[PDB]
Design a protein around this ligand. Structure first.
Ligand SMILES: *C(=O)[C@](C)(CC(=C)O)NC(=O)Cc1ccc(O)cc1
Length: 493
């Protein structure tokens, strides 16, 4: 066994602050007191063990067995993450081989409100979920290194040289607006209670900048206290759960219809008697007392038959192209851990059955983020701005995916879906014109944007297994109203 040893050892770096877009702290690295021991030194001071064990709330015998078992180690932890005053009280004992150190632990000041977005670090302050993992290299910084001389029992008797100072991690400003985040969190929670639903998501996006202003899910968890958390509660459902968007994609089917040269909003489709047979398969409407409907009526009534007949006429290829160009079934580029791409199925040739099902959003799988990004493109006069969960100062060039005239026309149809007789009146936003589309899948969807005249915000509300299909619209109304007021958006109604 050696009389001495030398070791280059790490100087830990301070992990970068995560903030919201206005500098509100979301993840902060705080100094904690850690008590450790050198067993080889402890072994010389056995009469001190019971007082030390007692000061660590350990049974004397369990503690003594642990030191005896680790007799040839030179390091063990006693307890991590104390108060300065707490460790002081144990160092006050002056037990040979017992040492306090100040290390870094994450605190999450908004806790459950932004847990799924921010994620969290492990005991070693390494990113393990969410933004913490996705931007770990950015946030982590670079350990320093220093040389120590140790005696026969491995205690440090000299600091020899620092070869490298630690470099702190970098601040990261998310796209999240904490004020919008708290409003969405509260309103989604209250909606689940009032509707006896057990899960849900709500996304708010800036249609001009591609920024995710809010992303909240239920259930959630306190990242400051992860004791015995149900794994369901840690799911960022908005990014990692896929669902069938159903009626919510009909505005993309209509976009292809209006681009085709073959359809204007005043054109009529006969949907009588509210069913349509396709070989063995029958398309069924929810309401079945219509004959002639104009294209705006097809959206207000959300006629499956009506959108199917339009799709037969223009062809599935036109609709598939719009859906792909607005990002359905496509990588968002966000690199969020576990983020899903979902599924926009293709065919070399589209028979009638597959054509219809595409047109009314059956057999597709999207995330709430993808559906919000699609609505954002439609709201932004047909131009898709790339998504960001970090603050955007320099907005990248968007891609024109729907002609501005067609997008403008579809916006107007979606304003009627909210505002017109027979429409989703509970999605109406006080002081503003709003636009959007419901969907019903045991699952309630609402997607939309406001103000309808000069749109600023897209929003998706998803409510899982309510206990009564239109539980999502009033949530859109409340959260859109609050978000537009917080953003000083001038009323347009
Ligand atoms: C849209 O909200 C709706 C009119 C609701 C409905 C239950 O028919 N249409 C669809 O969601 C389209 C659709 C129909 C059947 C199915 O299995 C998935 C999607």
């Amino acid at each position: 066994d050696p009389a001495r040893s030398v070791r280059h050892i790490a100087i830990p770096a301070h992990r970068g602050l995560i903030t919201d877009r206005n500098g509100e702290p979301l993840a902060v690295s705080t100094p904690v007191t850690t008590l450790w021991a050198n067993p080889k030194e402890l072994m010389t001071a056995k009469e001190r063990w019971p007082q030390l064990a007692a000061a660590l709330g350990q049974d004397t015998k369990l503690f003594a067995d642990r030191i005896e078992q680790n007799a040839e180690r030179e390091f063990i932890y006693l307890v991590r993450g104390l108060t300065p005053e707490q460790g002081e009280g144990v160092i006050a004992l002056k037990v040979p081989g017992v040492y306090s150190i100040e290390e870094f632990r994450r605190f999450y000041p908004a806790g459950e409100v932004v847990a799924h977005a921010v994620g969290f670090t492990d005991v070693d302050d390494r990113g393990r979920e969410g933004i913490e993992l996705a931007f770990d290299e950015w946030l982590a910084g670079v350990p320093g290194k220093r040389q120590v001389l140790k005696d026969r029992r491995g205690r440090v008797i000299k600091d020899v040289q620092v070869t490298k100072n630690a470099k702190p991690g970098k601040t990261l400003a998310l796209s999240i607006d904490l004020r919008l985040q708290y409003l969405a969190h509260r309103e989604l929670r209250n909606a689940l209670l009032e509707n006896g639903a057990k899960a849900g998501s709500l996304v708010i996006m800036d249609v001009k900048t591609g920024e995710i202003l809010a992303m909240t899910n239920q259930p959630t968890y306190n990242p400051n206290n992860r004791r015995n958390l149900q794994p369901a509660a840690m799911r960022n459902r908005a990014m990692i759960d896929v669902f069938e968007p159903g009626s919510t994609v009909k505005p993309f089917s209509m976009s292809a219809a209006l681009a085709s040269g073959r359809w204007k909003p005043s054109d009529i489709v006969d949907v009588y008697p509210g069913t349509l047979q396709i070989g063995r398969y029958t398309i069924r409407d929810v309401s079945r007392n219509s004959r002639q409907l104009d294209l705006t009526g097809i959206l207000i009534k959300s006629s499956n038959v009506g959108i199917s007949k339009i799709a037969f006429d223009i062809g599935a290829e036109s609709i598939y192209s719009v859906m792909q160009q607005v990002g359905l079934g496509q990588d968002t580029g966000l690199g969020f851990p576990g983020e899903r791409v979902g599924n926009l199925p293709n065919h070399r040739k589209w028979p009638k059955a597959e054509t219809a099902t595409l047109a009314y959003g059956y057999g597709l799988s999207v995330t709430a983020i993808q559906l919000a990004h699609a609505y954002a493109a439609l709201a932004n006069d047909g131009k898709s701005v790339p998504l960001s969960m970090t603050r955007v100062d320099r907005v990248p060039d968007g891609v024109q995916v729907i002609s501005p005239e067609v997008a403008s026309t579809v916006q107007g149809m979606l304003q009627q879906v909210v505002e017109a007789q027979g429409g989703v009146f509970r999605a109406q936003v006080p002081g503003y014109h709003a636009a959007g589309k419901s969907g019903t899948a045991y699952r309630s969807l609402f997607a939309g944007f406001a103000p309808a005249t000069d749109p600023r915000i897209a929003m998706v509300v998803v409510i899982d297994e309510p206990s009564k299909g239109l539980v999502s619209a009033p949530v859109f109304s409340k959260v859109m109203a609050g978000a537009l007021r917080l953003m000083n958006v001038p009323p347009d109604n």
